[PDB]
Ligand binder design. Structure first.
Ligand code: CHL
Ligand code: CLA
Ligand code: CLA
Ligand code: CLA
Ligand code: CLA
Ligand code: CLA
Ligand code: CLA
Ligand SMILES: CCCCCCCCCCCCCCCC(=O)OC[C@H](COP(=O)(O)OC[C@@H](O)CO)OC(=O)CCCCCCCCCCCCCCC
Ligand SMILES: CC1=C[C@H](O)CC(C)(C)[C@H]1/C=C/C(C)=C/C=C/C(C)=C/C=C/C=C(C)/C=C/C=C(C)/C=C/C1=C(C)C[C@H](O)CC1(C)C
Ligand SMILES: CC1=C(/C=C/C(C)=C/C=C/C(C)=C/C=C/C=C(C)/C=C/C=C(C)/C=C/C2=C(C)CCCC2(C)C)C(C)(C)CCC1
Ligand SMILES: CC1=C(C/C=C(\C)CCC[C@H](C)CCC[C@H](C)CCCC(C)C)C(=O)c2ccccc2C1=O
Ligand code: SF4
Lengths: 84, 742, 42, 222
């Protein structure tokens, strides 16, 4: 049952934020969004592999909110059935 | 960053100071000058602020002190579970909960006091309790004396754990300051760990234990044959025989087919007709919904990694034109002062306790709590008093902060500054309202009473005369009655049964709830509460603002937090210390609350509670007289004090005798307090002298010279007794009355 | 050891110990000679 | 020096001199600034090696008896999955020479002598070879390192005979094995909750049918 509706919605949501958290469309651990814009990047010291500063704590946040926006859309199931 | 640096062995565990009373304070340690010494020993025992001058030690003492407070509660819990196991008819109560009183105290028969062992039925005897543990132990599916015993041991163990923990963290390894001040992680754990995981774990126990078991008892089975709660958690097929959604296991939870658990996770609303309580499916769902919300909220404030907010920066963006610098600087003054936090926490925890008491009588959460008139009245009354006091405490410690910790050269705040600068406006405007409400709330009662006395019952304010209908409450009642239709399509019924529509819920010939009407007689009393609340706010608020200076005394701050007076000059300056403002507030807190718990008691007996006919007609306890007799002050004397004190007064010779004595005994203490409030010290000091002389004659003059109580102690003892006499009198008035009539 | 005894000798601790003993004694006597409205020995 | 998921905090104190180091520590624990009790980097290292050793004999006993029951000369009566050996009565039991709770107290006493003495040498080096203990005092002094006491009773033949690098190489092997066993035992448990057919069986279930993949199934049965 991999590839049903509830799956494609999940994989897009999670990857979109991980893209967003690493490429520049979200505040990661190394970018803080102020009262206005997002580009207020700083250092935090989480020595890792990803050259973009994407750490072990940012592969979890964007993964976490990857599912929070993944459940609200899927459980908007007034037009995709009630039981899968 | 955020780490755990503590110390090793700050203060050495030893018994020396246990034999040097008053070691903590430099003044008290020199010895007992006079009997004034043995009063100042307790008055400054816990004032850790006055002992030392740095925040680190004050912190470690309050941190360890809480462990003691935490430990006692566990010991208190342990007794309650133990007592319910060894000295109760609980297991009998589980058979016919409708008509067997909960009893969990049994007295030794020494001096005839075995008459107190009442015939609570169920083949047992003893003091009929009213704290309502039994509905709590049934809602958790206990159904055994053995299980009440083991938790009692488990509760007792934690008490030793906490008490040990307190010792360890003050004498062996005490935390440092930097540990304490890291308040981002503080909030972060409490939201996710304590509040969050607390519900989710509990939502666990309801799903696997309380729900399927109570579904047997409600279905109707003897308690002895209900398979033990670890049978469901092992034999998964048993849960199938009630709840088929438990066949698939936890995989729907992982495939977002959440509508499969609809058997035991619902959104019903209303109350359960069988047991008169909420539907345990909703309660099961409720803690689960709460769990997620708290847990996510836990992940907000930045602790050690990149993500998260800064509590300092949140307070430093909201600054407005009218307000100026806004909430800048509040981070400090809420971090380097315990009296700020204690004042702020007290108000919220004080307020929440009240909202608890408004909900637990309208959405009865435990089974067979609705038809327990002894419990409903007590639980509602209890948390009102607890809620009332804690709010008053928030005024005292806010006042203490203004005197001791506030300082406009370093911990400067702008909002707290602007609030000080126009304090004359704040009190005067609050003064006018308290007068406006005073005339238009009490006066309407007085005018009603005068017109009724003169034979003009067509000029009174009532439903049958000049009318005052609360429409705004009647409108909002209407909205919640039709909410299940449109504005909340999921809900089967309204969130309660007191909304202005629906139908009653009858349990064993006793009304659970029914729609509560709101006519004119309710309109007046709601504007009484708005009056006493405002006046109580006025006294406490004046104390907080004027705790440092006023147009009378320009240097009141220099005189401390609780000083008696500044002498009889300038016309007389008795009672200008902030401590004497809270001293005055206590009476009004005692005044506001008392009318609330009077309003609740009469309204429910007259309009809600009462038996129910088999035919279907309902007869309330007092015959529905609240709507006509509560509008005249004499009405509150005839039909409430005089007519509902019958049960307490003639309670001699039966198990309700102990209330008959306390009723009197609480009058004596109340009238006793007046000797301290009315009189003054200088008279009692002199009479003491003459008494002291006679002892010189017989050589029995003590060496701790007798003294009269200090000025602010004469008041402190005066208010304390007055409150104790007033509250206890109502206590004996309520329990004995309601226990006899239902 | 000395400090423990001294603490046990401070006034409040003696009071509960003294009065507690007194309460026990009176309760026992009332358990053995109850109702006791007169002193009918001599 | 290979580093795995390092952190700025980690490399301030994880100098690599401690064996088994890979600079992996994102929770502030081994930080030497904060030292009350049980947060000493030595004690944590002490608890690290011991837990591994207990795992290194705990794991093998957690798969030996049933797998030896697969071909070995063990009479099948005492060939059982580990959780039904008697540790967890609701999983099952077996009647040994004792009846349980006498085995426990016996075990707790025998352990008590070794454990407490094993503790004192951490508090007071060389102490456990001073008071009389029926001889044997010549050995129970230890070499000064609590985790590596040495002595002919503990290091009988003597490896790490003379090479620190080898010892550092050896101790590196001792921890990575230790980490491997701790995770492995955590594997034998969580498998049991979900699978419930015993550890070594659950490898066959993935042997004869790799398409089993009980992950996607997630059925729970005792
Ligand atoms: C009578 C009080 C008394 C108590 C409660 C203990 C109990 C203890 N002794 Mg001890 N002893 C006592 C007296 C004596 N001991 C000993 C000789 C020993 C030895 C040789 C050892 C102990 C050990 C121990 C400890 C571990 C026992 C255990 O594991 O429990 C289950 C424990 C503190 C062990 C220990 O302390 O290891 C650190 C240990 O090796 N005891 C002698 C004769 C010298 C004693 C004379 O009274
Ligand atoms: C864009 C997709 C989408 C759609 C069509 C809906 C549609 C709806 N949501 Mg929903 N929601 C969404 C995204 C969406 N939501 C997201 C992203 C979240 C955050 C996780 C939520 C969280 C949410 C909650 C918490 C609730 C709804 C509810 C509802 C219903 C009222 C409505 C039909 C309510 C409801 O009854 O759900 C069935 C409700 O209580 N929504
Ligand atoms: C958990 C909440 C809490 C905590 C931690 C404290 C803690 C404290 N309060 Mg406080 N207070 C509270 C609730 C609390 N109060 C409430 C609810 C009220 C309203 C009634 C007050 C009213 C109050 C006043 C009016 C004063 C304090 C004072 C004090 C300090 C000294 C207390 C002392 O020595 O008493 C020792 C204990 C006793 C004397 C026992 C009394 C026995 C009763 C009457 C029975 C201490 C920091 C005093 C202070 O800080 O002055 C500088 C002070 O003057 N408090
Ligand atoms: C029964 C006793 C009693 C009464 C009537 C009052 C009355 C009052 N107190 Mg009060 N007080 C009392 C006991 C009482 N107190 C006690 C025991 C304490 C100690 C704890 C206090 C402590 C206290 C404090 C600390 C404060 C008050 C305040 C007030 C006033 C606010 C209410 C208001 O404006 O209503 C208006 C007046 C009434 C409702 C009285 C009845 C008037 C009726 C409606 C009509 C009167 C007749 C009419 C004028 C016709 C005149 C006839 C003509 C021949 C003259 C009010 C004057 C507060 C205040 O003054 O600030 C606002 C305040 O801050 N009192
Ligand atoms: C402002 C008042 C108010 C309040 C407190 C709620 C409260 C709630 N609504 Mg709601 N709702 C309201 C007005 C309100 N509604 C209005 C004006 C509409 C437009 C018709 C809706 C339409 C609406 C929908 C469509 C749904 C809710 C749902 C809900 C629940 C989530 C919650 C009880 C959801 C629900 O049924 O919860 C179970 C849901 O699905 N509401
Ligand atoms: C009330 C919550 C609480 C909090 C915030 C802490 C916080 C801390 N404890 Mg602690 N502790 C607690 C309850 C708590 N403990 C209890 C109830 C016990 C008894 C079981 C202990 C027993 C305990 C020990 C034995 C140790 C700590 C240690 C620590 C520190 C790591 C940290 C300061 C450790 C530390 O480093 O010492 C400060 C440590 O050795 N605590
Ligand atoms: C600390 C590690 C540890 C622990 C707690 C256990 C625990 C146990 N083993 Mg065991 N075992 C272990 C390591 C461990 N094993 C290792 C490393 C091996 C391989 C060398 C074995 C080989 C083994 C066999 C062959 C048998 C046990 C058996 C048992 C059970 C009875 C105790 C026993 O061995 O009688 C002491 C046995 C003696 C011969 C003496 C008990 C559950 C027995 C059993 O029924 O298995 C559950 C059994 O017959 N063990
Ligand atoms: C009618 C008065 C409306 C009052 C109103 O809407 O206030 C709104 C007004 C808004 O202030 P600012 O927008 O400048 O403050 C921004 C806040 O974020 C704090 O800086 O608050 C005040 O200035 C104090 C007025 C209290 C008046 C209390 C009366 C009771
Ligand atoms: C480092 C760090 C850092 C950062 O900062 C944070 C974090 C990441 C969180 C952290 C992490 C941590 C971790 C992961 C840990 C782990 C551990 C373990 C697992 C252990 C085990 C451990 C384990 C162990 C010892 C085990 C052992 C076992 C045994 C003996 C067994 C026994 C047995 C047998 C045979 C059989 C029988 O019939 C039964 C029994 C009796 C049962
Ligand atoms: C290829 C490659 C790569 C990549 C990789 C990857 C792909 C990763 C991923 C990762 C991931 C993939 C992650 C994830 C994460 C996730 C998470 C962490 C989650 C969380 C969750 C949550 C938070 C949830 C919650 C909830 C619940 C539990 C219930 C209720 C509802 C909700 C949903 C809310 C690397 C880098 C190596 C390099 C280059 C190459
Ligand atoms: C009555 C009264 C007194 C007199 C009360 C006093 C002096 C204290 C009451 C006596 C207490 C009970 C001391 C007795 C306890 C001693 C420790 C002796 C104990 C011995 C017993 C075991 C018998 C004041 O001092 C006073 C001060 C200010 C305003 C009003 C008043 C006031 O109204
Ligand atoms: S009467 Fe008492 S309180 Fe008033 S001024 Fe005199 S001393 Fe002060």
């Amino acid at each position: 049952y991999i590839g049903s509706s509830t799956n494609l919605i999940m994989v897009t949501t999670t990857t979109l934020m991980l893209f967003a958290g690493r490429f520049g469309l979200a505040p990661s651990a190394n970018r803080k969004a102020t009262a206005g814009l997002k580009l207020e990047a700083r250092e935090s010291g989480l020595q890792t592999g990803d050259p973009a500063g994407f750490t072990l704590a940012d592969t979890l946040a964007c993964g976490a909110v990857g599912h929070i926006m993944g459940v609200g859309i899927v459980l908007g199931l007034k037009n995709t059935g009630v039981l899968d | 960053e955020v780490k755990i640096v503590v110390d090793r062995d700050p203060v050495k565990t030893s018994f020396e100071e246990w034999a040097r009373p008053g070691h903590f304070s430099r003044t008290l340690a020199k010895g007992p000058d006079t009997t004034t010494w043995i009063w100042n020993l307790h008055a400054d025992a816990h004032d850790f602020d006055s002992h030392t001058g740095d925040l680190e030690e004050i912190s470690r003492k309050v941190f360890s002190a809480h462990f003691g407070q935490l430990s006692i509660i566990f010991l208190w819990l342990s007794g309650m579970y133990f007592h319910g196991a060894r000295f109760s008819n609980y297991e009998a109560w589980l058979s016919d909960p409708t008509h067997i009183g909960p009893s969990a105290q049994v007295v030794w028969p020494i001096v005839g006091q075995e008459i107190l062992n009442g015939d609570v039925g169920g083949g047992f005897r003893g003091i009929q309790i009213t704290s309502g543990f039994f509905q709590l132990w049934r809602a958790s599916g206990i159904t055994s004396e053995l299980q009440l015993y083991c938790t009692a041991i488990g509760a007792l163990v934690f008490a030793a754990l906490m008490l040990f923990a307190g010792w360890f963290h003050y004498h062996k390894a005490a935390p440092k300051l930097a540990w304490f001040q890291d308040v981002e992680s503080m909030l972060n754990h409490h939201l996710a760990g304590l509040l969050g995981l607390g519900s989710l774990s509990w939502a666990g126990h309801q799903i696997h234990v309380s729900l399927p078991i109570n579904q047997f008892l409600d279905a109707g089975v003897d308690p002895k044959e209900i398979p033990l709660p670890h049978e469901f958690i092992l034999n998964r097929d048993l849960l199938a025989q009630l709840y088929p959604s438990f066949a698939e296991g936890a995989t729907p939870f992982f495939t977002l087919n959440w509508s499969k658990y609809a058997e035991f996770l619902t959104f019903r609303g209303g109350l359960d007709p069988v047991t008169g309580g909420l539907w345990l499916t909703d309660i099961a769902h409720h803690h689960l919904a709460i769990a997620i919300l708290f847990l996510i909220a836990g992940h907000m404030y930045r602790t050690n990694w990149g993500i998260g907010h800064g509590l300092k920066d949140i307070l430093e963006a909201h600054k407005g034109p009218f307000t100026g610098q806004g909430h800048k600087g509040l981070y400090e003054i809420l971090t380097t002062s315990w009296h700020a936090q204690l004042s702020l926490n007290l108000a919220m925890l004080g307020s929440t306790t009240i909202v608890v008491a408004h909900h637990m009588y309208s959405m009865p959460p435990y089974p067979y709590l609705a038809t327990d008139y002894g419990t409903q009245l007590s639980l509602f009354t209890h948390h009102m008093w607890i809620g009332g006091f804690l709010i008053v405490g928030a005024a005292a410690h806010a006042a203490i902060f203004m005197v001791r910790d506030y300082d406009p050269t370093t911990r400067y705040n702008d909002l707290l500054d602007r609030v000080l600068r126009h304090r004359d406006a704040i009190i005067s405007h609050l003064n006018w309202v308290c007068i406006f409400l005073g005339f238009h709330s009490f006066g309407l009662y007085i005018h009603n009473d005068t017109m009724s006395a003169l034979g003009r019952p067509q000029d009174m304010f009532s439903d049958t005369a000049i009318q005052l209908q609360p429409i705004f409450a009647q409108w909002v009642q209407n909205i919640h009655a039709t909410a299940p239709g449109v504005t909340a399509p999921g809900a089967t019924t309204s969130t309660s049964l007191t909304w202005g529509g629906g139908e009653l819920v009858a349990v064993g010939g006793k009304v659970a709830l029914l729609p509560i009407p709101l006519g004119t007689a309710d309109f007046l009393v709601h504007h009484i509460h708005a009056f006493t609340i405002h006046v109580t706010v006025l006294i406490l608020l004046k104390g907080v603002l004027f705790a440092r200076s006023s147009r009378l005394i320009p240097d009141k701050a220099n005189l401390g937090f609780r000083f008696p007076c500044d002498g009889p000059g300038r016309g007389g300056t008795c009672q200008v210390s902030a401590w004497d403002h809270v001293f005055l507030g206590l009476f009004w807190m005692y005044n506001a609350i008392s009318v609330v718990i009077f309003h609740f008691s009469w309204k429910m007996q007259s309009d809600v509670w009462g038996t129910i006919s088999d035919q279907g007609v309902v007869t309330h306890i007092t015959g529905g007289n609240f709507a006509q007799s509560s509008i005249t002050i004499n009405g509150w004397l005839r039909d409430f004090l005089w007519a509902q004190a019958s049960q307490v007064i003639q309670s001699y010779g039966s198990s309700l005798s102990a209330y008959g004595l306390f009723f009197l005994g609480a009058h004596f203490v109340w009238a006793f307090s007046l000797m301290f409030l009315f009189s003054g010290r200088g008279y009692w000091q002199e009479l003491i002298e003459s008494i002291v002389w006679a002892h010189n004659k017989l050589k029995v003059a003590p060496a701790t010279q007798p003294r009269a109580l200090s000025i602010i102690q004469g008041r402190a003892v005066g208010v304390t007794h007055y409150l104790l006499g007033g509250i206890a009198t109502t206590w004996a008035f309520f329990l004995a009355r309601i226990i006899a009539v239902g | 050891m000395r400090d423990i005894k001294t603490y046990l000798s401070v006034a409040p601790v003696l009071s509960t110990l003294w009065f507690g003993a007194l309460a026990g004694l009176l309760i026992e006597i009332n358990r053995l000679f109850p109702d006791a409205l007169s002193f009918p020995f001599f | 020096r290979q580093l795995w998921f390092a952190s700025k905090q980690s490399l301030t104190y994880l100098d690599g001199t401690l064996p088994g180091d890979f600079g992996f520590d994102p929770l502030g624990l081994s930080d030497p600034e904060g030292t009350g009790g049980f947060i000493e980097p030595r004690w944590l290292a002490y608890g690290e090696i011991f837990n591994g050793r207990t795992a290194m004999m705990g794991v093998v006993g957690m798969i030996a008896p049933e797998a030896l029951g697969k071909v070995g000369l063990v009479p099948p009566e005492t060939a059982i999955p580990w959780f039904q050996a008697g540790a967890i009565p609701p999983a099952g039991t077996y009647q040994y020479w004792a009846d349980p709770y006498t085995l426990f107290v016996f075990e707790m006493a025998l352990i008590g002598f070794a454990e407490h003495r094993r503790l004192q040498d951490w508090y007071n080096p060389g102490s456990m070879g001073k008071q009389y203990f029926l001889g044997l005092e010549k050995y129970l002094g230890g070499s000064g390192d609590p985790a590596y006491p040495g002595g002919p009773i503990f290091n009988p033949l003597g490896f790490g005979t003379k090479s620190e690098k080898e010892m550092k190489e050896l101790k590196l092997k001792e921890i990575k094995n230790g980490r491997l066993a701790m995770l492995a035992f955590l594997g034998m448990s969580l498998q049991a909750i979900f699978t419930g057919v015993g550890p070594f069986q659950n490898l066959l279930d993935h042997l004869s049918d790799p398409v089993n993949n009980n992950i996607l199934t997630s059925l729970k049965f005792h």
